[PDB]
């Protein structure tokens, strides 16, 4: 922990980018989190919304 002052920023940046990427796994109310699948199963009047 002696190098904690560089480790906390390195860990926070790795965790922040990891969380930023992980937000693509979040659903936000959609039927599925993956964009490639949403368009296939949804007709434009519901796919656009």
């Amino acid at each position: 922990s002696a190098l904690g002052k560089l480790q906390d920023v390195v860990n926070q940046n790795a965790q922040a980018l990891n969380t930023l990427v992980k937000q693509l796994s979040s659903n936000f109310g959609a039927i599925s989190s993956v964009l490639n699948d949403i368009l296939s199963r949804l007709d434009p009047p519901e796919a656009e919304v």
């Binding site: 007709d43 434009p44 009047p45 656009e48």
Partner: protein, 49 residues
């Protein structure tokens, strides 16, 4: 835009709709700025047989 359709599938005359008529005969854009009007035309567009 004037044409005859049927009550079944008549709902496809709306922006961004799919189906045999909407995909192969008349397709409305997603960004439609206008309105569609329909009325029963039995006396003029229906003939026996």
């Amino acid at each position: 835009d004037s044409f005859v359709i049927r009550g079944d599938e008549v709902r496809q005359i709306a922006p961004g709709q799919t189906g045999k008529i909407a995909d192969y005969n008349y397709k409305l854009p997603d960004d439609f700025t206008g309105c569609v009007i329909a009325w029963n035309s039995n006396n003029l567009d229906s003939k026996v047989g």
